[PDB]
Amino acid sequence: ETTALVCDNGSGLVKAGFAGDDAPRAVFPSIVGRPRHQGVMVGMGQKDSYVGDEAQSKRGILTLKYPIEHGIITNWDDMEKIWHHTFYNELRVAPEEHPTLLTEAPLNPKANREKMTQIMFETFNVPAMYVAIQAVLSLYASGRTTGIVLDSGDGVTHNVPIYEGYALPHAIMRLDLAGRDLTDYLMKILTERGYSFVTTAEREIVRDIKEKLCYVALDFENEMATAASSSSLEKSYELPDGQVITIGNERFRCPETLFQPSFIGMESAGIHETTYNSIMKCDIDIRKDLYANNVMSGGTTMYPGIADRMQKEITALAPSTMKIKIIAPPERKYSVWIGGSILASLSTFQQMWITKQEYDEAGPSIVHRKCF
């Protein structure tokens, strides 16, 4: 028939695919490269700029721009290259023929969702589209109608409580801490051990170090005492050139900043306290049922041990009589996409789409009133 496309713009990975299947088939970094060097060989097929997996194949010679910083799209012209590459090259499906579903963080400038709509109608002639909140989609992806979703990707972290399918707008918390800022801190702590990663290529190398070797200490203080007192933690990793670099307490110490943003100088408390302070903004009849489900979403949650650290220290904050249950499916890195895949295939959703008719009638202003 026709099937919606489902896209999650994110930062770092873009992930896209068809509605009503199990996993995205286009997953690639949202990264744009331009050559900076003198080009020597005549007759190369020299190419102006590179997108996605190509830019990380050639990264040694490229500046890498991320077009999305903290869920805001800062550079539009390079964003359009990413979308254009997604539909034509990665999916090989013309956007005129498919509805499209787009994903965003809450509490961010409305001009962003306006212009994101305008491009889809005017440049791609997408027949219809919708913009959905990442948190909401994580619940569809985990099979609940009730829970408080803690979501952190690259860029923005946000909590949204939901109870029987009603969001509670006054309780939404947003925090910029997650994602790249872990890596931009890790590069500083690695400098203490005499390695220096300056370039945007080296940033991607640190981004791989973090994914391989970092983990969260259940008690932070005893594991610093131990790794000070012994080498037994120490693990070593091979750089792209065959050098080998060795990392000790830094590898737990970097994700710990999620729980103490004082390390990087951020103003406000770590995700346990923003999750608890979010539940405290909810009327007292539902707190039991939010404490009973906490759904972790997006890639930053993947650090080993983070679930047990959360569950422990929230059980320290909460009153003792309640069950705190932390829910962290192993697939959670994809949850926002899987939840959009479920949502876009519901029959009830076929009235929700913004159609081109309504955009042409009322202009991009429509998004705010028709969408959440």
Binding site: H70, I72, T74
Partner: peptide, 7 residues
């Protein structure tokens, strides 16, 4: 962003 932050 536009004010309180770089984006």
């Amino acid at each position: 962003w536009x004010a309180x932050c770089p984006a």
